[PDB]
Design a protein around this nucleic acid. Sequence first.
DNA 1: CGGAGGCGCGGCCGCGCCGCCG
DNA 2: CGGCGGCGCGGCCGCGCCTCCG
Lengths: 354, 353
Amino acid sequence: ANFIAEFFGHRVYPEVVSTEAARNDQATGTCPFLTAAKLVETSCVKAETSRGVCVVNTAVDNERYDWLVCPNRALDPLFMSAASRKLFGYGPTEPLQFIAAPTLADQAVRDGIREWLDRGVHVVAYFQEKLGGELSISKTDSSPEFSFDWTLAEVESIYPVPKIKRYGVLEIQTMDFHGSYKHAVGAIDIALVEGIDFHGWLPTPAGRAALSKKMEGPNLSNVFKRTFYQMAYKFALSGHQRCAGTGFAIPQSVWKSWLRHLANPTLIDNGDGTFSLGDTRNDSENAWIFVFELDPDTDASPRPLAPHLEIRVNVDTLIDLALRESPRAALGPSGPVATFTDKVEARMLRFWPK
Amino acid sequence: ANFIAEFFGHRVYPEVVSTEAARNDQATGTCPFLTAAKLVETSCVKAETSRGVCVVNTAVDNERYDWLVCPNRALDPLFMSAASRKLFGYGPTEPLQFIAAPTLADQAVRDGIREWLDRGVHVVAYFQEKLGGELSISKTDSSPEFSFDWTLAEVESIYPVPKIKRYGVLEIQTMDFHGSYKHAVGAIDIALVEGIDFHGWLPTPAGRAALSKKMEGPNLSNVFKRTFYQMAYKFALSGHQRCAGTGFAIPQSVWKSWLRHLANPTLIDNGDGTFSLGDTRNDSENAWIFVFELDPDTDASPRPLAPHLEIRVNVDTLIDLALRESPRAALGPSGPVATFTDKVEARMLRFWP
DNA sequence: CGGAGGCGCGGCCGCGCCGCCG
DNA sequence: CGGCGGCGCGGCCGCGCCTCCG
Ligand SMILES: [Ca+2]
Ligand SMILES: [Ca+2]
Ligand SMILES: [Ca+2]
Ligand SMILES: [Ca+2]
Ligand SMILES: [Fe+3]
Ligand SMILES: [Fe+3]
């Protein structure tokens, strides 16, 4: 029922979408997303028990879902540049240059940036775990330590010393799972090395069994617990003058799983290709949730990220929905808590003999 | 720097408890808390890589702390009964029977409950994962599924069919860690079987180096993330008329780590052996945080849980402190965000030749 | 109704930043 | 002004409940 969906960036379950490059990435063991970003060959960062498992496919409530399972699978600079526009308040057709932070060591691009600042072209450099390293805000007696997945830097000048106008934050959350992939990885790895035709073997019942061997479901409530807190906290930090906006990038599958956690919220249609969660018409701290898909239309080797839903969020609404609205629905007339007393009595009754 | 604090329920780092009972439980691999709760010999439920590591000792901000790392180490029926009195509204000195749900199978205790009920004595049966299994509430379109660590059934009737007046909820939280215990466990496991006099070997430099082998620190923020959500949600659920109250039981160490998460809060002294987090005069959700210690006074082999701090919480204040007050402190003067713009530029300048 | 699978729960794992000590 | 190390972060792990499907 549960399947490894992508193996080193390339589809294996729903379709075995494999070109010549797909054969190579899997044989060498290379995450194509780190390689394309850094322009240097890079193997997946994961331990042997889950090596190359970038996406897992499962059903919840009788519907199929791709679950991103590696933060590096959502390492799509092109998508992040687009989401950046919404954070810094740029138009859709505005000149923008989105470069990595390690590139700043190169003279050729430092001379290039200066020319862009003269033209009025926006220059944003990003700091990411494997591309420059993350940035952190230190703990206090009244505040905990925090780290940002993507720190965006809007450049003002770099003439003598690099200086920024504003900064941006993108937070990525994928999904973690129950159990292990060890058995599914182990079974498909022997068909990779010892086997003579791997891609022709994956769509077969034997390969489909191997891709699913002891594969379990997603840790749904776990990521909501961890991501909700970071949302509420980091969105409040976005209200700082020098912070242009904070956005959380999450897959469609993850967004849908959060709906019950948010008391089944109705999104407001703004008529601007964007949606809103609560009243964002006043005193806004430019808080965003970018719900993305794995592009089902591209045909290109690794499916890139495509926008699915762009939600501007009211923080107090987000807090109120999760911690007040949802419990009240659980305390509803036909809800689970109404019948709980009978459940306790039923569970007690099981210990009675005969 | 970081040490295994106790092995199979008996202290090993700060002081080595060297009783015959401490030697026996270690050599036989029994978690002494499960075997005492259901009166049947039971080994630790943990996997080989962390087997027996029921507590870990670490320093944060230059002071020592014991981190419980096994929910079964907090399995203390004696402590939970005292905490339940606060939940159901019993005085400190009034009759109370606190029994595990599995025992309901016995006809001797079933008749015993009937005898207690008609003499006004309170009877509460508890459901815990290893003792009767946990109770859960199922998901809806507007609410997620939840499980309760301890669900407490205040019995009123047994004769025809078991029936309860109210239910109570106790949630238990300890601590998870970074890295592995594997290397420290494997270093002392070979000392247990292949060597002689295990306790005498533990306090030596070589032993203390073994107890600390690649031992890392507590996963502090992780635990707050997971538990805060359960607090806010389950405390709101406690408002239900059939729910007497819900309490969260945590070690002192983890409560101290929560202070920065709660904008450094100041507890209001009620002058009744109880403190309050916010205004708890009106509308009572009957929500509690029971902060406990590993009893340092009594020198029994496994040191039981002793009350350290008994807190009434205003749920709305708990949410406010963590999600509004704390972020505002971080944005304040001399805060980390104030100097963040310079940090970006400094990190940006590190690429310059 | 009985075995299989979903998933809350909560402890294992290591990367890489930054604070602390010498 | 360098290297141990604390710790945020976020993905691995399996227990035992319950709901679903044959
Ligand atoms: Ca991060
Ligand atoms: Ca995140
Ligand atoms: Ca708990
Ligand atoms: Ca539990
Ligand atoms: Fe990957
Ligand atoms: Fe244990």
